[PDB]
C-alpha cells in the first residue's frame, strides 16, 4: 500500500511545519530545503499549497525562491504549475521590475492550454513597461507564446509589438527582438519580416556597436539571411561590420565573417574594396585560435570551409595553424586539414618539416594522419613530390613499425601519380618486408612489385612469399596479389608460369568470396581467349614474341587439391 508515504511524520511533515512558521527566516530555509529536494527527485508534491502560501510576502528573496520552485514544475509538470495563475497576473502589476519580468518568464515556460486566457493582457503591459529588463523579458516571451497553440491574429499584433521593440533605447531589447523574431520567422508561413528595413538594418548596425555581446550574435545572424540587390547596398553594410574583429571572442567574429563572405561575392569582385576586406579578415580569424580549446574547433571548421572558397585570404598566415603537443586531437586534425589546403610552393619548406615533427611523436593516431597528410602535400603540388619522398624514407629508417607501414602506403599513392620516376627506392623499401602486419601496407608492397615487376629480377620470390598463407590474408591483399601475379605473368611469361597457377586456382577453386572467384575467372578467361587483348586491358601506357605466352597458358590448369 502507502508504506513509507505518511504525511503525519518524517521529512515532509517537518517541512510543511517550517513552511508555516511565522518567522519568515525559517520559511526561506524551508523553500530551499524543498528546492534542494526536487533536484534529488523527492515527492515534494504534498507541499505545493504551503510553498505557494510563502508568496504572501513583501520579501524579495522569499518570493523569488517560491518562483524557482514553480519553474522546476513548469518544465517537468506543466499541469502542476497552472494552479498558481492568479499570482503571475498580479505579480506583473507589482511595483518592482525584478518581480514583473519574473511573472512573465514563468507564465511563458508553462506549456499547456488554458495559459492563453491569463497571459495575453499582462504581456501588453510589459512590452510598453517603464523598465528594459521587463521589455527584454516580454520580447523573449512573445517567442514562448508563438511556440504554444494558435498562431493568434493578436500575436500578429505582437509581431508589430516585436518590430516596434527593434526601435528602442536599449539594444538588449533590440537584441532579444531580433532573436525572438527570426525564431518565430522560421515557423508557419514564410516571408514575415522582410520590411523596407534600411532603417531596420540601420538600428541593427548601430545596435551592433554598443550592444551586450550576445545581442550582436543574434543580429549578425539575421543580417546573414538577407540578399542585397546592388553593390553599394551590400558594400556599406560590410563597412559598419568592420569593427566586429574582437567582441565576444568567437561568437561574433564568426557571425561577422559569415556575413562578410555572403556580401563579398555580391561585391563586384572589383579589387577596389574587395581587396581591403580580404586583408582585414586574416587577423581576426587567427585570434580565435588561441581562446578555449573547444571554440578553436568550431573556428577551424568554418575556416576550412572559408579556405575551400578563398584560399588566398590566409595564404599569408599558414604559420598560425601548425600543431602544439597539448592540443586536443580534434583540434590537431582540423589544423592538419587546413595546413594541407594552404600548401603553396613557398611554405612546403616549413610545412613538410612540421609534418615530420608530428610523425615522430607518441600519439599513434595523429602520427598516422600526419604521414598520410604528407601524401596530400605531394598529390596537391608536383614540385615538392621529391622533398616529400625524402621525409617518408627518413621515417622508414627510424624503424617505428606503424610509421613504416603508413609511409610505405603513401609512397604507393605517389608512384601512382608520379610514375617511372621514383624507382631506386623499391630495393630500399623491401629491406622492411619481414614486419608488415597491417593488411593495407601489405597490398601497397604487393602492387609496387605489380608495376615494376621488370625493374626487379627479385619480384618472382616475393609474390610467392605472400601466396604461402593466401587465406588468413585480407581479401584486399588476395585481390592486390591476384592483379599483381597476373601482372608479373603479362611481363615475364615463362619463369612466372609457376605463380599464375595457384593464385588463379585459389581464386576460382579454393575461396568462397564470389567477388574474388569472379576476378580469378575474369582473368583466367582473359589469358585463355587471346593473351593480346589481356595485355591491353591489364597494363596502361608509359611515362612479336607471344609464343612464350601461348606455350605457358596451354601448360597451366587450375585445381583445389
Amino acid at each position: 500500500s502507502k508504506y513509507f508515504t505518511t504525511n503525519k511524520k518524517g521529512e515532509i511533515f517537518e517541512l510543511k511545519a517550517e513552511l508555516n512558521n511565522e518567522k519568515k527566516e525559517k520559511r526561506k530555509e524551508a523553500v530551499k530545503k524543498v528546492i534542494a529536494a526536487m533536484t534529488v527527485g523527492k515527492d515534494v508534491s504534498s507541499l505545493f499549497p504551503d510553498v505557494v502560501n510563502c508568496m504572501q510576502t513583501d520579501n524579495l528573496e522569499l518570493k523569488k525562491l517560491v518562483y524557482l520552485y514553480l519553474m522546476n514544475y513548469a518544465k517537468s509538470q506543466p499541469d502542476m504549475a497552472i494552479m498558481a495563475v492568479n499570482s503571475f497576473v498580479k505579480d506583473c502589476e507589482d511595483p518592482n521590475p525584478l518581480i514583473r519580468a519574473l511573472a512573465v518568464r514563468t507564465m511563458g515556460c508553462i506549456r499547456v492550454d488554458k495559459i492563453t486566457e491569463y497571459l495575453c493582457e499582462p504581456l501588453r503591459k510589459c512590452l510598453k513597461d517603464e523598465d528594459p529588463y521587463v521589455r527584454k523579458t516580454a520580447a523573449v516571451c512573445v517567442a514562448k507564446l508563438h511556440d504554444i497553440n494558435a498562431q493568434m491574429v493578436e500575436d500578429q499584433g505582437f509581431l508589430d509589438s516585436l518590430r516596434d521593440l527593434i526601435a528602442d533605447s536599449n539594444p538588449m531589447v533590440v537584441a532579444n527582438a531580433v532573436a525572438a523574431l527570426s525564431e518565430i520567422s522560421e515557423s508557419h508561413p514564410n516571408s514575415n519580416l522582410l520590411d523596407l528595413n534600411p532603417q531596420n538594418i540601420n538600428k541593427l548596425l548601430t545596435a551592433l556597436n554598443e550592444c551586450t555581446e550576445w545581442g550582436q550574435i543574434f543580429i549578425l545572424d539575421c543580417l546573414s539571411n538577407y540578399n542585397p540587390k546592388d553593390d553599394r547596398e551590400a558594400q556599406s553594410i560590410c563597412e559598419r561590420v568592420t569593427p566586429r574583429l574582437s567582441h565576444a571572442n568567437s561568437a561574433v567574429v564568426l557571425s561577422a565573417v559569415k556575413v562578410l563572405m555572403k556580401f563579398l561575392e555580391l561585391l563586384p569582385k572589383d579589387s577596389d574594396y574587395y581587396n581591403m576586406l580580404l586583408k582585414k579578415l586574416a587577423p581576426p580569424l587567427v585570434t580565435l585560435l588561441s581562446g578555449e580549446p573547444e571554440v578553436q574547433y568550431v573556428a577551424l571548421r568554418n575556416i576550412n570551409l572559408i579556405v575551400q572558397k578563398r584560399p588566398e585570404i590566409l595564404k599569408q598566415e599558414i604559420k598560425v595553424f601548425f600543431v602544439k603537443y597539448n592540443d586536443p586531437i580534434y583540434v590537431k586534425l582540423e589544423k592538419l586539414d587546413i595546413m594541407i589546403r594552404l600548401a603553396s610552393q613557398a611554405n612546403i619548406a616549413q610545412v613538410l618539416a612540421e609534418l615530420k615533427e608530428y610523425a615522430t611523436e607518441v600519439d599513434v593516431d595523429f602520427v598516422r594522419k600526419a604521414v598520410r597528410a604528407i601524401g596530400r602535400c605531394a598529390i596537391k603540388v608536383e614540385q615538392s613530390a621529391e622533398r616529400c619522398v625524402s621525409t617518408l624514407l627518413d621515417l622508414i629508417q627510424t624503424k617505428v613499425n606503424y610509421v613504416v607501414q603508413e609511409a610505405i602506403v603513401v609512397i604507393r599513392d605517389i608512384f601512382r601519380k608520379y610514375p617511372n620516376k621514383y624507382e631506386s627506392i623499391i630495393a630500399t623499401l623491401c629491406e622492411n618486408l619481414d614486419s608488415l602486419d597491417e593488411p593495407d601496407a601489405r597490398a601497397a608492397m604487393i602492387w609496387i612489385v605489380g608495376e615494376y615487376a621488370e625493374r626487379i629480377d627479385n619480384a618472382d620470390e616475393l609474390l610467392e612469399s605472400f601466396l604461402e598463407g593466401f587465406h588468413d590474408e585480407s581479401t584486399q591483399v588476395q585481390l592486390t596479389l591476384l592483379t599483381a601475379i597476373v601482372k608479373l605473368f603479362l611481363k615475364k611469361p615463362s619463369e612466372t608460369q609457376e605463380l599464375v597457377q595457384q593464385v588463379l586456382s585459389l581464386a576460382t577453386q579454393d575461396s568462397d568470396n564470389p567477388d574474388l572467384r569472379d576476378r580469378g575467372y575474369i582473368y583466367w578467361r582473359l589469358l585463355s581467349t587471346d593473351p593480346v587483348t589481356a595485355k591491353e586491358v591489364v597494363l596502361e601506357i608509359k611515362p612479336a614474341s607471344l609464343d612464350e605466352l601461348k606455350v605457358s597458358i596451354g601448360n597451366i590448369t587450375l585445381s583445389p587439391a
Binding site: 524557482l68 518544465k75 506549456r111 527584454k136 561568437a251 568550431v298 597539448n326 611523436e361
Partner: protein
C-alpha cells in the same frame, strides 16, 4: 536555441538540469550519457549530432556541462555561453566540482532563469547580475637517477600493457568487468630530462575491482603528470578501471540438451573493434560434461579439438580483424544414468592479444626537456606500443 542544460558527475549522474523546449525529454539526458559520457570506443569531439538533436559539452574537473538543441544553431555561441556560465558559477563558489554544485543547487537554479531565457544567452556577466540574484554561493575549504648519463641517441619506449576481465551472462549482460593496466617506460635519455606526459581522461586519480591509480615515486601532479625518469626500464603508473571498458570479443553460446543422450553446442564469437586492427593468439575454451562419449567438432575459421583430460573443446584462431564473426559447432554424446541432478555448467573462457588498451587509455604526448645538454624533444626517437591481453574473460552458458 539551447533547448536544454544538464550537469553530470564523473558517474554520469545528472546533478542539476533545466529543459527549455519540449524536444528534450527523457530522450535527451540519456543520449548524451550513452553516446558521450559512457562513449567506449569513440575518440569524441565537443559537438555530437545524435538523430536530429545536437550536443555541446565542456568538461570541468569531474563535471560534464552539456547543452542540447534539437535545431542546429550558432555552434560558437552555445560554447561561448557555457564558458561564461562556468565564469558566473566560479565567481560565487570557486572550483566547478561535484561538491560545490551540490552545496549550490538553489543558487544555480537562480542563475539559469537569468543567464538563459528560452535558450537565449542573456547578461551573463557578474556586475550586471548582483541585482537579479538573491542567493549567495557556499565556497568550502635526485634518488633514482645517476648524475652524468649520456647516449649518442636519446630514445624512449612506452608500453601500455592491459589485462581485461569479463563475466557475461548467456544473454550477453556484462555481470562484472575490470581492466588491470600499467605503462612501462624504457628511457635512454642523456642528462636529467624533465618529462611532461599527457593521456585521455579514462584513468581517474570473489573480489570486487575498485578503480585506483599508483605512480612511480618520481611523478609530480598537476591534466598531465611530469617527472625525471629513472634510466632504462621502469613502471610509470599501475591502475585498474571498471567503467566504460572496450570488450574486444562477445561470445554468444547456443547450448541445447537434446534429452540426456546428445548435447548440441554452437558458439559464435564476434570481434567488436576497428576493422583495420587484428587480435592474435585467439583461443576459445568450451567446457564438456565429465561423462562424454565421442565429440564431432566442425569450425570454418581456425582449428579445434576435444581435450578429454582437460574436459573441454579448445578452438584456436591465429588472427581475426574487427567487425568479423566466426562459428564452431559441436555434437557431444553422453552415457548417463548417474545422479538425478544434471551438469552445472562452467563458463566459456577466451585468450587473445589486441593492439589497443581495453580501458581506452591513449598516450597523447610526452615532452622531454633537458636544461643543460644540447638536445630537445624534436631530437628524441619515440616508439609507443599497445598490448591488450585477455585476463579471466568468462561467458556463462
Amino acid at each position: 536555441m539551447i533547448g536544454g542544460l544538464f550537469i553530470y558527475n564523473h558517474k554520469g549522474e545528472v546533478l542539476i538540469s533545466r529543459v527549455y523546449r519540449d524536444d528534450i525529454g527523457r530522450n535527451a539526458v540519456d543520449a548524451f550519457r550513452v553516446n558521450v559520457i559512457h562513449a567506449r570506443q569513440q575518440v569524441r569531439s565537443p559537438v555530437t549530432n545524435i538523430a536530429r538533436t545536437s550536443f555541446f559539452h565542456v568538461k570541468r574537473s569531474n563535471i560534464w556541462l552539456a547543452a542540447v538543441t534539437k535545431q542546429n544553431v550558432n555552434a560558437a555561441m552555445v560554447f561561448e555561453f557555457l564558458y561564461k556560465m562556468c565564469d558566473v558559477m566560479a565567481a560565487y563558489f570557486g572550483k566547478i566540482s561535484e561538491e560545490n554544485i551540490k552545496n549550490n543547487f538553489v543558487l544555480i537554479y537562480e542563475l539559469l532563469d537569468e543567464i538563459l531565457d528560452f535558450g537565449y544567452p542573456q547578461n551573463s556577466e557578474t556586475g550586471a547580475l548582483k541585482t537579479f540574484i538573491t542567493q549567495q554561493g557556499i565556497k568550502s575549504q635526485i634518488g633514482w637517477r645517476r648524475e652524468g648519463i649520456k647516449y649518442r641517441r636519446n630514445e624512449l619506449f612506452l608500453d601500455v600493457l592491459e589485462s581485461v576481465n569479463l563475466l557475461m551472462s548467456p544473454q550477453g549482460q556484462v555481470l562484472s568487468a575490470h581492466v588491470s593496466g600499467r605503462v612501462v617506460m624504457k628511457s635512454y635519455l642523456s642528462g636529467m630530462p624533465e618529462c611532461k606526459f599527457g593521456m585521455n581522461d579514462k584513468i581517474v586519480i570473489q573480489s570486487i575491482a575498485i578503480d585506483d591509480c599508483t605512480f612511480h615515486q618520481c611523478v609530480r601532479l598537476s591534466r598531465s603528470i611530469s617527472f625525471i625518469p629513472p634510466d632504462g626500464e621502469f613502471e610509470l603508473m599501475r591502475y585498474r578501471t571498471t567503467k566504460d571498458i572496450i570488450l574486444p570479443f562477445r561470445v554468444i553460446p547456443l547450448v541445447r540438451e537434446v534429452g540426456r543422450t546428445k548435447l548440441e553446442v554452437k558458439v559464435v564469437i564476434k570481434s567488436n573493434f576497428k576493422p583495420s586492427l587484428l587480435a592474435q593468439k585467439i583461443e576459445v575454451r568450451i567446457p564438456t560434461p565429465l561423462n562424454t562419449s565421442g565429440v564431432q567438432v566442425i569450425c570454418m575459421k581456425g582449428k579445434a579439438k576435444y581435450k578429454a583430460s582437460e574436459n573441454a573443446i579448445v578452438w584456436k584462431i591465429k588472427r581475426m580483424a574487427g567487425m568479423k564473426e566466426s562459428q564452431i559447432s559441436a555434437e557431444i554424446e553422453l552415457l548417463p544414468t548417474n545422479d538425478k541432478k544434471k551438469w552445472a555448467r562452467p563458463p566459456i573462457s577466451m585468450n587473445f592479444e589486441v593492439p589497443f588498451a581495453p580501458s581506452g587509455l591513449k598516450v597523447r604526448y610526452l615532452k622531454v626537456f633537458e636544461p643543460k645538454l644540447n638536445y630537445s624533444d624534436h631530437d628524441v626517437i619515440k616508439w609507443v606500443r599497445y598490448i591488450g591481453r585477455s585476463g579471466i574473460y568468462e561467458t556463462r552458458c
